[PDB]
Amino acid sequence: RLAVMVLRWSDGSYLEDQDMWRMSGIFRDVSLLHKPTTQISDFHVATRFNDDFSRAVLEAEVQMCGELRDYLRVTVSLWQGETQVASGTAPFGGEIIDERGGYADRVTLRLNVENPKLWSAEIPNLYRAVVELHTADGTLIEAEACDVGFREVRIENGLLLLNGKPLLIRGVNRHEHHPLHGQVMDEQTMVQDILLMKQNNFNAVRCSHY
Amino acid sequence: PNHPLWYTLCDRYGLYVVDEANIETHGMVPMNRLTDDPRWLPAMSERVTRMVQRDRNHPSVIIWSLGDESGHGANHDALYRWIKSVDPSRPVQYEGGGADTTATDIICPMYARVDEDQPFPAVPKWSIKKWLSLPGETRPLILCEYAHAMGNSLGGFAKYWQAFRQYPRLQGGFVWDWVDQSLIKYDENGNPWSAYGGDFGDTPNDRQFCM
Numbered sequence A: 001r002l003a004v005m006v007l008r009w010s011d012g013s014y015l016e017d018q019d020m021w022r023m024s025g026i027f028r029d030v031s032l033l034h035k036p037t038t039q040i041s042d043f044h045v046a047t048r049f050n051d052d053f054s055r056a057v058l059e060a061e062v063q064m065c066g067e068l069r070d071y072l073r074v075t076v077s078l079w080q081g082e083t084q085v086a087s088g089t090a091p092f093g094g095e096i097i098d099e100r101g102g103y104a105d106r107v108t109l110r111l112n113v114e115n116p117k118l119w120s121a122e123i124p125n126l127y128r129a130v131v132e133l134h135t136a137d138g139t140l141i142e143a144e145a146c147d148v149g150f151r152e153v154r155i156e157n158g159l160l161l162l163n164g165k166p167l168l169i170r171g172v173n174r175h176e177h178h179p180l181h182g183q184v185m186d187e188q189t190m191v192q193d194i195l196l197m198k199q200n201n202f203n204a205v206r207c208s209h210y
Numbered sequence B: 001p002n003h004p005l006w007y008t009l010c011d012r013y014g015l016y017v018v019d020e021a022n023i024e025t026h027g028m029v030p031m032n033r034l035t036d037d038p039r040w041l042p043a044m045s046e047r048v049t050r051m052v053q054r055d056r057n058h059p060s061v062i063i064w065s066l067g068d069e070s071g072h073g074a075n076h077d078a079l080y081r082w083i084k085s086v087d088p089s090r091p092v093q094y095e096g097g098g099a100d101t102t103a104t105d106i107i108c109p110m111y112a113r114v115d116e117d118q119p120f121p122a123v124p125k126w127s128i129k130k131w132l133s134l135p136g137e138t139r140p141l142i143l144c145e146y147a148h149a150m151g152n153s154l155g156g157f158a159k160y161w162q163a164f165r166q167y168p169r170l171q172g173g174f175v176w177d178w179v180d181q182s183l184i185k186y187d188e189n190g191n192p193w194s195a196y197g198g199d200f201g202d203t204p205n206d207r208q209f210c211m
């Protein structure tokens, strides 16, 4: 048995003065997650590019918790559909960071991608990154994953550029609101909103304000 | 460069002066044919350098100009730097080659409109409000020529002034121009009348465009 005591007002409320209905409760999902003792505790995915975006390096930093062991490995594999496009495997132990060494509990994988299919709101090309924590011999401990969009966002010479091109933001602010369920969101309502947005020539959304 | 007394009068009465080198090659095709040619650098240099040597002590002169309507050539960049080196006390401006080249401290277009872009290839005349905020652009904008006062004209003059007052980096301009270039001719009874292009048997000519 779980018991949850939810307070409507807190010191947190002082930072939650958004122009919206003031409600309370357990309004998003509750779940149980089982992880092994030796586990992926964090991972960051970066994509960097050459000048014409014909070449990319996918860089994945992976952190583990649990007992450090020589036989431990991380494999990051990148998939375009059912085709594996790149893969990197390494033991734990980051590069030297300072006078006390580096992160023994971290590893960075670098995968080369030639002619990456680029992500944008116009063509949302996605790859699948799979982060496998495993033994040298190939026994899986656990896998985490995410969708990867190859794109560069930067400001240059006073312009916001996506993949080297200046954006024109056709945006809208969107609160999480349902007339019957209040501030509880479901997949159907989210999908309805996105379809309507794109159908009406929107390409951008601001999570106002959270 | 003007008659020397002009600067004395501007010093004393109080007018800001743009002193301008006697260099205009408007009729060349393309406009920079001579100004990009190193063989014409000696002749151009003397029209700039000798102006500076004559007029550099006049307080009324606040800005030097490399001339007018001669495109943009490497000779302009050379003479721009010469002035910057010799007299740091005065900005240098020049309109040719699109009004915002490397030979000018001031965005100085001629007849750029307030709100309307005129996107000519190679040498566009942007809306002045738009010109200021072009990516990477930081310079002040002062029109070297605007509000062409030919005959019944100066329509839309207030639109410039509203813009000049609203935008800090829009710092005004020079109306084109002060005085009609009409000449006196006389009828059979000796009565004077105002003549323009073509009235002296001059041909080809550009008719009333001198006024």
Ligand SMILES: CC(C)S[C@@H]1O[C@H](CO)[C@H](O)[C@H](O)[C@H]1O
Pocket: B110, B145, B209, B210
């Ligand atoms: C007619 C344009 C193509 S050139 C135009 O002619 C004007 C006529 O008064 C002025 O001389 C301007 O300086 C010039 O830009």
Ligand SMILES: [Mg+2]
Pocket: A017, A018, A019
């Ligand atoms: Mg508010």
Ligand code: NA
Pocket: B163, B164, B165, B166, B167, B168, B169, B170, B171, B172
């Ligand atoms: Na101004």
Ligand code: NA
Pocket: B209, B210, B211
């Ligand atoms: Na004229």
